[PDB]
Design a protein around this ligand. Structure first.
Ligand SMILES: CCCCCCCCCCCCCCCCCC(=O)OC[C@H](COP(=O)([O-])OCC(O)COP(=O)([O-])OC[C@@H](COC(=O)CCCCCCCCCCCCCCCCC)OC(=O)CCCCCCCCCCCCCCCCC)OC(=O)CCCCCCCCCCCCCCCCC
Ligand SMILES: CCCCCCCCCCCCCCCCCC(=O)OC[C@H](COP(=O)([O-])OCC(O)COP(=O)([O-])OC[C@@H](COC(=O)CCCCCCCCCCCCCCCCC)OC(=O)CCCCCCCCCCCCCCCCC)OC(=O)CCCCCCCCCCCCCCCCC
Ligand SMILES: CCCCCCCCCCCCCCCCCC(=O)OC[C@H](COP(=O)([O-])OCC(O)COP(=O)([O-])OC[C@@H](COC(=O)CCCCCCCCCCCCCCCCC)OC(=O)CCCCCCCCCCCCCCCCC)OC(=O)CCCCCCCCCCCCCCCCC
Ligand SMILES: CCCCCCCCCCCCCCCCCC(=O)OC[C@H](COP(=O)([O-])OCC(O)COP(=O)([O-])OC[C@@H](COC(=O)CCCCCCCCCCCCCCCCC)OC(=O)CCCCCCCCCCCCCCCCC)OC(=O)CCCCCCCCCCCCCCCCC
Ligand code: HAS
Ligand code: HAS
Ligand SMILES: CCCCCCCCCCCCCC(=O)O[C@H](COC(=O)CCCCCCCCCCC)COP(=O)(O)O
Ligand SMILES: CCCCCCCCCCCCCC(=O)O[C@H](COC(=O)CCCCCCCCCCC)COP(=O)(O)O
Ligand SMILES: CCCCCCCCCCCCC
Ligand SMILES: CCCCCCCCCCCCC
Ligand SMILES: [Ca+2]
Ligand SMILES: [Cu+2]
Ligand SMILES: [Cu+2]
Ligand SMILES: [Cu+2]
Ligand SMILES: [Mg+2]
Lengths: 143, 573, 54, 63, 54, 325, 189
């Protein structure tokens, strides 16, 4: 991610430059095919659109400073250099499906605008998110 | 240096896992409910996408049948209006966006040399939320009133508590919101696997064009989908409660239009870059030539990343509320990187050895289509030309050369290409060619003359027209060829079903012969962890050098235009 | 689970580059992992490593 | 080549039938049925052409 | 105070986990990253239940 | 300046000949743009075809080739020449774009007649707001606004009972609308006809009662969205034309999704002689109880729309293609 | 050495927080558009007389305080201190649950003297922006509680430490959004 943190500056500076052009060009140019005055949707959502790229770019930049030369980031690396452990990946879980079902229940709750359905769907969602996180933590059954 | 390992006696082979023909009872039922394997998830993610394709395309036929002749033969105004709303929605958000992540879930971990995705339980949630959103959105048809009937853009104040009442319009909003969570849940872990989980020696610039495209799309989908969710939840807040945010008396119409099109065109380009990548995978393998201008492609894709954000109000030239010069010019720019990456394809095929299998046929039948689609795109990008063409029927023809271009031709190309990888079996060539020719003639027939009618004064969302308009012969031709386009899926479905359980067995880890991507260095299908062994990655084509060692010196010596004089340079320390 | 063992979430990379998942046998192994398959017993088999109090 | 020409002729006759059938049923519901007829005809013609263009440059051999 | 389960590491020129860096490429194992698997079937404390029906 | 005859006809792709100088300019621009687009397309397609007929697998077998021929990947010299060319093309195209778009979007054409277009669900309503003293009833510049009928709308701004949510104004503030004396109202079974003079600068003032509609005249080669409260939306509700050159009846359609009967709100433009139009205005001004059809008959015109017919409202009719009235 | 490398979960959470910021881009857009044409006819001034600026500062400092305590909790997780994490997370939960009650009380005292959703454009825009933030704060509090009950069952390895660090990321984002939202509503007017 040495180069990943860098390539975000491209879009960041581009969108920052376009946002400032947009604000100044929309509030001071009368075209005849529109009216004069700053547009408050293309300005806020394009200033803050550059914000996303800047955030991710800066975070990855700070992160990449304090990382050693990884084999994946090394041009002439042997396959045997990463020989070790790649951390912990969940093999299986039923909870993603359940919590999709829970968001579906809340969705229809909001559609029909039934208070009980919204309330149940909200707490049916908290439960499933909780169970997703506590999946590998459920203690050995104490008698 | 290279550190040649000692020849160990006894090493025979990996297990070479069995193809998909032989499955026992219960082997898949509960596995799919709880799976966190990106392979099976991707398979079911593509299948579901195509199911929605067939379902959403049936609506297009009903629309197209009604337009055969003047007068309302079987369909009403209300039913016709809610039939293009749901057709344009199911095809863009229930087939388009998912099919993007299906090719992402399957081959992106396989292309960078990863064992799995970063968040296996999260993309498993991304599949289940999208399907739920889809089912929720379509529940509108099961209400007496019907589904949403405002288009796929839900303009204001046509889409408020006053106008368009009924629960279908809420279902549409909520379903769109839910399917948009699946896109961001998938973009999170298509972006962090690229960063973190990569094979030894696979630098960022060793990754294929496909993964670069999904990289750019991921960062591009993170800033558009939340915005749509915010806008749609603003409308729901207006409808369900008594909010006044979207009243015409304070923007409202224009507010929504800006808010929508700001994600309207970024979602459009989330449907194009991955399929440009798919095509960028297929062309080099069938031409026995490397991807011409690899870094050129990188820069082109990166340009479309940033430029696509500054062009959103070119969708609203006739509103008389936007700065015409700003959006007109910005749109003219976004054609330049596309032109670049489009010349790169020609460069790749240039003086190559082309074998015409189904993937290459599809890919070439793509460029010819999307080219004309994009050509009539710069037409609409000029306001003097867009005044006549906006909200009209020439527009309809335009975004069917680009949508049916990318998301259909390149998607099908990807299916034929990766089928041996995904299943260990190969698709029938004759049936594939039949499918291509049907879906090609049947498409150009139904959409070419569509241009002509739009210019002579037929607007888009019209249930009916008069005989004294001249739009009779054209509608007739379009309907005939559309019914032909609808039949093209018959060979496709038969091919996929038959070849899944009876297709020819793949006995080599690279059936297409000259594959140059990390997926072609593994068994078909891969063994549950993507790799029973990992090669040395020294370029963007690690599988090619793996299979063809005798030419490793040839592909370096003549890769550049000339003045290449490093083969005679002294060694470093 | 009885044939191969509990699927632990430890995706190790072998020196050759093969990604392998660590399996925890519930029974005796023969020579080099590959646990002797335990016959079904009509009871609930553990599926996670937290069910063994790890 | 064998299958091809048969498919072309069958498609052609069906398409001609459809084109003729449209003219009677003016602007009724049956115009849709006639559209389906011509679509099937055209489909068969293109199927014949596709099989013709496959036995010319085949990519799969019979074992 | 330092948790018993915390990996035995030198608190000098080395930190096991901070805000943004770690020692693995992926999620840390919830059963201790320093735990060597697999283990003998005895340590699991799983009792294969012999059952006979009829 | 269209290129030639039949070729020029082909390049239009059914684009109407255009009855306005604005339309003529747009038509010319369109023709030339298509000339260039066709060329570029031909080149791109030509390369795609040569990829089939020239660069093949066992095409390159007669010459004892083999595989992996000339495995080039980076033509840097021909890489910075194919980026620049599209840039130049788009810049030269944008110049003409901005040049052409200035004609239509100009608001300094000194109109001699203003029409208040009012789009509602689902029809149109025209009213003659201002008319120049030349082609006026008496000679004094016609001033078409209703004293008490407009002031009643201006008074709808505040709800007498507490209801001013939208920036201290009534939710249903219908005051942006303009009510006139001479008004043509379109019924579900009578197509509204707007009568205009020839060789005269007309201005159009667009607003909507409820929802967004679109004033599209295919012969104008132009459309514009009419928005409820156009000022708040910051949309220019006014557009002008230099003149209309042709005489006759021209269709107009709503080119913006607006509820169910969207396909069924069509209007007509009847462009008539200058003097004739003046006479029309005189007749309808001195006869406020008369109807538009009677006024049209007064000047020897067809009383009803000739380029359009009303739709039959019966749902379960029209099955046999008889949808006209 | 062990060849240290980026925290995968932290990078995943930062990429999630970026998208959540664009969620509020929509809300801010809606607020600013309604503000623009509210100032036009001099109606905005009348509506912002319903704001309790002093009261909105006390809750601000409460939320900032919660953030600082949260960071203290995370400082305790790097070192494997279970109890340091446990204590500061509880104080953050308490501090963050009185913000919601405080914010909720403001709503109750605001609808009492005129300002509702169905009363003005200002009212609708005020409640959309502040309402969604309140939902996010509730979600953050629930995240804290689930982390607290996660380290009650598991053995507190670096896995639990990582979970705590990412939840802190979410909390920091939420309070930063509040900081940006308070200036917009109560200061800029
Ligand atoms: C599409 C939508 C998909 C939704 C379907 C997925 C829901 C799965 C339910 C979870 C229960 C099953 C389970 O634990 O694992 C399987 C378990 C086997 O695995 P296992 O080895 O035992 O390990 C699992 C653990 O033991 C289990 O771990 P544990 O021991 O910690 O958990 C014990 C217990 C937790 O302890 C409790 O007792 C919890 C009490 C509930 C609290 C609720 C809070 C509010 O678990 C539960 O009971 C959780 C169930 C909650 C699910 C809520 C989400 C449902 C969606 C809502 C939709 C509503 C639609 C309305 C219908 C409309 C009709 C018009 O048993 C089963 O096989 C049961 C199968 C259940 C059917 C699933 C197949 C669905 C196919 C439907 C076709 C569509
Ligand atoms: C490129 C493709 C584009 C063209 C697509 C259209 C052509 C169709 C060709 C499809 C194909 O390739 O073979 C299907 C292929 C058959 O593979 P196989 O190895 O021969 O498995 C069948 C064996 O009998 C082994 O399976 P089994 O018989 O042991 O398990 C039974 C299973 C077999 O059926 C399935 O797995 C599919 C059932 C899902 C669709 C029906 C909705 C059920 C709810 O059906 C169930 O029991 C369904 C209950 C579980 C899911 C409930 C949710 O099935 C899939 O790959 C599943 C994909 C379905 C999409 C996921 C739908 C999620 C449900 C949402 C509600
Ligand atoms: C709008 C909503 C947008 C939803 C977009 C999709 C959610 C994307 C989540 C990104 C997080 C990335 C990540 O690390 O995944 C971990 C994990 C995936 O599991 P995995 O990949 O197998 O394990 C990851 C690592 O290998 C091992 O890592 P680990 O197991 O140690 O993970 C530690 C975990 C420990 O953290 C927790 O335990 C927190 C549990 C969540 C609190 C409950 C909130 C309700 O931390 C996280 O969950 C990561 C970030 C922590 C803060 C995220 C809080 C999100 C709150 C929901 C957003 C705002 C909702 C407002 C709307 C109100 C309407 C409902 O994701 C979760 O645990 C799910 C939590 C978020 C679900 C939100 C869905 C709400 C949908 C509402 C629809 C209306
Ligand atoms: C300030 C306001 C915010 C509050 C901060 C919350 C931080 C809590 C962190 C501590 C924690 O979660 O402890 C781990 C603890 C782990 O318990 P465990 O050892 O696995 O117990 C289950 C064993 O199977 C069996 O173990 P056991 O028999 O020793 O279980 C003891 C059992 C005692 O038995 C009961 O109390 C069962 C009755 C349920 C209460 C129903 C109330 C209706 C009257 O406690 C519970 O089951 C939890 C109910 C606590 C009431 C929450 C409402 O988590 C919990 O069980 C408590 C869940 C916390 C949810 C928070 C809801 C309250 C927040 C708003 C006030
Ligand atoms: C995935 C499918 C799609 C892609 C990709 C796409 C990108 C473009 N689109 Fe689009 N689009 C429009 C035009 C363009 C242009 C200029 C590009 C660009 O991406 C085009 C890229 C350029 C090329 C692909 C050309 C490459 C070919 C060569 C050879 C390279 C060199 C060419 C040069 C230098 C040009 C010189 C050529 C000459 C003839 C001088 C316009 C109007 O300007 C509207 C709104 C209309 C309205 O007013 O409502 C619109 C909106 C849509 C909608 C919905 C519209 C709605 O109202 O709901 C869809 C479904 C869609 C499809 C797609 N669109 N588009
Ligand atoms: C990738 C995205 C898209 C594809 C693919 C697509 C395919 C077609 N479209 Fe389209 N489209 C139109 C014509 C066609 C035709 C003839 C096809 C063809 O590709 C047709 C494909 C048909 C099929 C592929 C059907 C095969 C199915 C068969 C033969 C039987 C299925 C049987 C069963 C039992 C179903 C299986 C069920 C299960 C549950 C498994 C027309 C006009 O006739 C309009 C404008 C309407 C208007 O007036 O504005 C239009 C409008 C749109 C819009 C704008 C929506 C709006 O204005 O609100 C979008 C975004 C869009 C995208 C797409 N469109 N199209
Ligand atoms: C097991 C089979 C049951 C047989 C039911 C037959 C199916 C018909 C069902 C009709 C449902 C009507 C729903 C409805 O109209 O909603 C409401 C009317 O009925 C109800 O309130 C449903 C109450 C159901 C219990 C939910 C309690 C939630 C608290 C959970 C705490 C643990 C109307 O909406 P509202 O109350 O205003 O929010
Ligand atoms: C649709 C989701 C939008 C969520 C925005 C959150 C808005 C917060 C409401 C604050 C109350 C404002 C005061 C008020 O006017 O109160 C009342 C009106 O507002 C309400 O009833 C509050 C609605 C409750 C929000 C529902 C939560 C949605 C769950 C999310 C699942 C997606 C006053 O009623 P009254 O005019 O006196 O009759
Ligand atoms: C690239 C085309 C942008 C549209 C015109 C830009 C106008 C420049 C605004 C300068 C205003 C000075 C305050
Ligand atoms: C009078 C002109 C002021 C223009 C200010 C533009 C600000 C837009 C970005 C706001 C970002 C808020 C998060
Ligand atoms: Ca009809
Ligand atoms: Cu666009
Ligand atoms: Cu209309
Ligand atoms: Cu309309
Ligand atoms: Mg429009």
């Amino acid at each position: 991610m040495k180069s990943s943190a860098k390539l975000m500056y491209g879009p960041t500076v581009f969108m920052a430059a376009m946002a400032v052009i947009y604000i100044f060009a929309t509030m001071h140019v009368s075209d005849g095919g529109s009216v004069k005055g700053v547009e408050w949707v293309g300005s806020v959502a394009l200033v803050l659109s550059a914000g996303l790229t800047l955030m991710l770019g800066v975070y990855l930049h700070f992160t990449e400073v304090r990382v050693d030369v990884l084999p994946e980031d090394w041009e002439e690396a042997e396959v045997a250099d990463k020989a070790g452990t790649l951390g912990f990946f969940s093999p299986s879980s039923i909870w993603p499906a359940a919590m999709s079902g829970a968001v579906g229940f809340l969705a229809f709750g909001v559609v029909y605008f039934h208070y009980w359905m919204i309330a149940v769907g909200l707490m049916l969602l908290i439960f499933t998110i909780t169970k997703l996180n506590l999946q590998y933590g459920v203690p050995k059954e104490k008698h | 240096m290279t550190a040649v390992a000692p020849r160990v006696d006894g090493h025979v082979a990996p297990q070479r896992p069995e193809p998909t023909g032989h499955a026992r009872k219960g082997s898949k039922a509960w596995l799919m409910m709880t799976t966190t394997d990106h392979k099976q998830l991707g398979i079911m993610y593509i299948i579901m996408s195509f199911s929605f394709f067939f379902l959403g395309g049936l609506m297009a036929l009903l629309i197209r049948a009604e337009l055969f002749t003047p007068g309302l033969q079987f369909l009403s105004n209300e039913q016709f209006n809610q039939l293009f709303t749901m057709h344009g929605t199911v095809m863009l958000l229930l087939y388009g966006t998912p099919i993007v992540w299906g090719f992402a879930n399957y081959v992106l971990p396989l292309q960078i040399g990863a064992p799995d995705v970063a968040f296996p339980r999260l993309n498993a949630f991304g599949f289940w939320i999208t399907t739920v959103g889809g089912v929720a959105m379509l529940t509108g048809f099961l209400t007496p009133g019907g589904a949403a009937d405002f288009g796929w853009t839900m303009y204001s104040p046509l889409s408020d508590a006053i106008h368009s009442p009924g629960l279908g319009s809420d279902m549409w909003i909520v379903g769109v919101g839910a399917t948009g969570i699946g896109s961001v849940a998938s973009a999170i872990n298509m972006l962090t696997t690229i960063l973190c989980l990569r094979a030894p020696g696979m630098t960022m610039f060793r990754m294929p064009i496909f993964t670069w495209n999904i990289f750019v799309v991921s960062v591009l989908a993170l800033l558009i989908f939340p915005l749509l969710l915010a806008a749609a939840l603003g409308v729901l807040y207006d409808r369900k409660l008594g909010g006044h945010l979207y009243d015409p008396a304070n923007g409202g119409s224009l507010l929504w239009q800006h808010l929508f099109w700001f994600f309207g065109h970024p979602e459009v380009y989330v449907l194009a870059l991955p399929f440009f990548g798919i095509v960028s995978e297929i062309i080099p393998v069938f031409s026995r030539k490397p991807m011409f201008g690899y870094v050129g492609l990188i820069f082109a894709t990166l340009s479309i990343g940033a430029l696509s954000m500054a062009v959103w109000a070119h969708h609203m030239f006739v509103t008389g509320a936007v700065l015409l010069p700003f959006f007109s010019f910005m749109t003219f720019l976004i054609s330049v990187p596309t032109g670049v990456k489009f010349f790169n394809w020609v460069g790749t095929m240039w003086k190559g050895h082309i074998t015409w299998e189904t993937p290459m046929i599809w890919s070439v039948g793509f460029m010819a289509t999307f080219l004309f689609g994009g050509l009539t795109g710069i037409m609409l990008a000029s306001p003097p030309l867009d005044f006549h063409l906006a909200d009209s029927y020439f527009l309809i023809a335009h975004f069917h050369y680009t949508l049916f271009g990318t998301v259909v031709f390149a998607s099908c190309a990807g299916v034929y290409f990766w089928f041996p990888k995904m299943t260990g079996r190969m698709m029938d060539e004759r049936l594939g060619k039949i499918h291509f020719w049907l879906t090609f003639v049947g498409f150009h027939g139904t959409f070419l003359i569509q241009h002509w009618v739009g210019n002579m004064g037929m607007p888009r969302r019209y249930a009916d027209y008069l005989d004294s308009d001249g739009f009779t012969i054209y509608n007739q031709i379009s309907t005939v060829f559309s019914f032909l386009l609808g039949l093209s899926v018959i060979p496709f479905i038969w091919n996929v079903f038959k070849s899944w359980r009876y297709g020819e067995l793949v006995t080599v880890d690279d059936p297409w012969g000259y594959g140059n991507s990390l997926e072609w260095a593994t068994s078909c299908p891969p063994p549950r962890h993507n790799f029973a062994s990992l090669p040395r990655i020294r370029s963007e084509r690690p599988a090619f050098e793996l299979h063809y060692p005798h030419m490793i010196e040839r592909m370096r010596a003549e890769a550049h235009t000339g003045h290449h004089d490093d083969i005679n340079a002294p060694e470093l320390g | 689970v009885l044939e191969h063992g509990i699927e632990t979430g430890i995706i190790k990379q072998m020196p050759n580059g093969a990604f392998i998942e660590v399996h925890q046998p519930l029974g005796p192994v023969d020579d080099h992992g590959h646990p002797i398959p335990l016959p079904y017993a009509g009871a609930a088999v553990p599926k996670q490593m937290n069910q063994l109090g790890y | 080549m064998g299958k091809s020409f048969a498919l072309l002729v069958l498609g052609a006759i069906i398409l001609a039938g459809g084109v003729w059938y449209t003219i009677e049923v003016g602007y009724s519901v049956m115009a849709i049925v006639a559209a389906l007829i011509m679509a099937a005809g055209g489909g068969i013609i293109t199927w014949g052409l596709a099989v013709a263009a496959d036995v010319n440059s085949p990519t799969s051999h019979k074992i | 105070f330092v948790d018993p389960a915390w990996p035995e590491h030198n608190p000098a020129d080395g930190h096991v986990v901070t805000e943004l860096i770690s020692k693995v490429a992926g999620a840390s194992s919830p059963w201790g990253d320093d735990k060597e698997f697999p283990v003998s079937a005895e340590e699991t404390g799983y009792v294969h239940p012999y059952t006979r029906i009829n | 300046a269209p290129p030639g005859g039949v070729l020029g006809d082909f390049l239009r792709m059914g684009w109407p000949d255009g009855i306005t100088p604005e339309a003529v300019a747009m038509g010319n621009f369109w023709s030339w743009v298509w000339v260039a687009a066709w060329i570029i397309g031909i080149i791109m397609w030509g390369l795609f075809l040569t990829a089939i007929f020239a660069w093949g697998a066992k095409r390159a077998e007669k010459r004892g080739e083999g595989e992996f021929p000339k495995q080039l990947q980076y033509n840097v010299p021909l890489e910075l020449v194919l980026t620049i060319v599209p840039i130049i093309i788009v810049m030269v195209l944008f110049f003409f774009t901005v040049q052409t778009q200035d004609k239509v979007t100009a608001l300094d054409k000194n109109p001699e007649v203003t029409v208040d277009v009012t789009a509602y669900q689902w029809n149109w309503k025209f009213g003659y707001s201002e008319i120049d003293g030349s082609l006026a009833p008496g000679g004094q510049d016609y001033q078409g606004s209703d004293p008490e009928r407009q002031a009643a709308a201006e008074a709808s701004k505040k709800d007498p009972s507490g209801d001013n949510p939208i920036h201290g104004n009534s939710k249903s503030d219908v005051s942006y609308l303009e009510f006139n004396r001479i008004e043509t109202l379109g019924t579900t079974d009578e197509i509204p006809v707007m009568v205009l003079p020839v060789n005269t600068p007309i201005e159009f003032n667009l607003a909507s009662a409820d929802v967004a509609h679109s004033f599209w005249v295919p012969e104008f080669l132009f459309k514009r969205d009419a928005y409820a409260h156009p000022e708040a939306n910051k949309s220019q509700r006014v557009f002008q034309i230099e003149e209309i050159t042709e005489e006759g009846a021209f269709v107009g359609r709503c080119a913006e999704m607006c509820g169910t009967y969207h396909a069924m709100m069509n209007f007509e433009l009847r462009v008539v002689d200058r003097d004739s139009f003046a006479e029309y205005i005189s007749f309808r001004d001195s006869n406020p109880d008369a109807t538009n059809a009677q006024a049209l008959e007064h000047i020897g015109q067809a009383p009803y729309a000739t380029s359009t017919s009303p739709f039959v409202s019966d749902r379960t009719a029209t099955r046999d293609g008889e949808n006209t009235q | 050495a062990a060849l240290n490398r980026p925290n995968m979960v932290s990078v995943g959470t930062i990429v999630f927080l970026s998208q959540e910021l664009m969620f509020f881009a929509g809300l801010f857009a809606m607020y600013f558009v309604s503000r623009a044409n509210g100032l036009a006819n001099g109606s905005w001034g009348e509506q912002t007389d319903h704001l309790n600026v002093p009261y909105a500062l006390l809750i601000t400092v409460i939320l900032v305080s919660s953030s600082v305590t949260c960071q203290f909790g995370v400082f305790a997780a790097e070192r494997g201190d279970v109890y340091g994490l446990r204590k500061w997370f509880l104080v953050t939960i308490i501090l963050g649950s009185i913000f919601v009650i405080g914010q909720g009380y403001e709503y109750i005292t605001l609808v009492g003297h005129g300002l509702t959703i169905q009363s003005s454009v200002y009212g609708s825009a005020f409640f959309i922006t502040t309402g969604f933030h309140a939902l996010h704060v509730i979600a953050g509090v629930m995240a804290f509680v689930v982390v607290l009950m996660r380290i009650h069952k598991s053995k507190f390895t670096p896995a639990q430490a990582t979970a705590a660090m990412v939840v802190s990321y979410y909390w920091h984002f939420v309070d930063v959004v509040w900081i940006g939202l308070f200036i917009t509503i109560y200061f800029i007017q």
